[PDB]
From a paper:
To test this hypothesis, we engineered a PhoQ PD mutant that contains an internal disulfide bond predicted to restrict conformational dynamics between α4 and α5 and the α/β-core. The PhoQW104C-A128C disulfide mutant was designed to inhibit motion between α2 and α4, allowing us to determine whether the dynamics of α4 and α5 play a critical role in activation. As predicted, the PhoQW104C-A128C PD formed an intramolecular disulfide bond between W104C and A128C, covalently linking α2 and α4 (inset). The protomers in the PhoQW104C-A128C PD structure are highly similar to each other, with an average root mean squared deviation (r.m.s.d.) of 0.3. The PhoQW104C-A128C PD is structurally similar to wild type and has increased stability. While the wild-type PhoQ PD unfolded with a Tmapp of 56°C in the presence and absence of TCEP, the PhoQW104C-A128C PD had a significantly increased Tmapp of 75°C. When reduced with TCEP, the PhoQW104C-A128C PD was slightly destabilized relative to the wild type, with a Tmapp 52°C. Therefore, the W104C-A128C disulfide increased the intrinsic stability of the PD at pH 5.5 relative to wild type. A disulfide bond between α-helices 2 and 4 inhibits PhoQ activation by acidic pH and divalent cation limitation, but does not inhibit activation by CAMP. Combined, these results suggest that the mechanism by which the W104C-A128C disulfide bond inhibits PhoQ activation by acidic pH and divalent cation limitation involves a loss of conformational flexibility between α4 and α5 and the α/β-core. In this study, we have shown that activation by acidic pH and divalent cation limitation are separable from CAMP-mediated activation by rigidifying the interaction between α4 and α5 and the α/β-core. The work in this study led to the construction of a specific S. enterica Typhimurium PhoQ mutant that is inhibited for activation by acidic pH or divalent cation limitation. This mutant has wild-type virulence in susceptible and resistant mouse models of systemic infection suggesting that, at least in these models, acidic pH and divalent cation sensing are dispensable for virulence.
PhoQ is the sensor kinase component of the PhoPQ two-component regulatory system that governs the phosphorylated state of the response regulator PhoP. PhoQ exists as a dimer within the inner membrane and has a periplasmic sensor domain (PD) that transduces signals across the inner membrane to the cytoplasmic histidine kinase domain. The PhoQ PD is a member of the PAS-fold and PDC-fold domain families. Unlike other PDC-sensors, which bind small ligands in a defined binding pocket or PhoQ PD homologs found in environmental bacteria, the PhoQ PD from bacteria that primarily interact with animals has no apparent binding pocket due to an occluding structural element: α-helices 4 and 5.
Author numbering: 48 to 187
The structure:
């Protein structure tokens, strides 16, 4: 889980560059866009610097306390938000349709790994957050 999302976090760390008070992430050519993760990068103060996808409901669901340490956490969000997160994913969209019909405020829980990268000569201190886009309720 955490140990598993750590790999994606490390990847995005090595992909990132710090230039002119800004994070830039250049994605590798032909990289899978269909991986079930979304990564966010914050500064040590907890300011969001970069996000793989701009999804405000999920971003607002990230608790600031979490951001100062390494940890494994859970987002408690809604089926509307999860549907926005999984928009491109066809099959998932079918399932999501179903669940939306049974309950329109159905709760969705997403695993999250928070990862700390101390400042180096190359890079300032960063917190990298990796979210499992498939919620616990849909894993089975």
């Amino acid at each position: 889980t955490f140990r598993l999302l750590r790999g994606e976090s490390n990847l995005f760390y090595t992909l990132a560059k710090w230039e002119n008070n800004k994070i830039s992430v250049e994605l590798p050519e032909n990289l899978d866009m269909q991986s079930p993760t979304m990564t966010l990068i914050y500064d040590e103060t907890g300011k969001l610097l970069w996000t793989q996808r701009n999804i405000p409901c999920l971003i607002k669901s990230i608790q600031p306390e979490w951001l100062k340490t390494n940890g494994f956490h859970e987002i408690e969000t809604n089926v509307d938000c999860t549907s926005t997160l999984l928009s491109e994913d066809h099959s998932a969209q079918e399932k999501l349709k179903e669940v939306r019909e049974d309950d329109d405020d159905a709760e969705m829980t997403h695993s999250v790994a928070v990862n700390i990268y101390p400042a180096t000569a190359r890079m300032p201190q960063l917190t990298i957050v990796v979210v499992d886009t498939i919620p616990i309720e849909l894993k089975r």
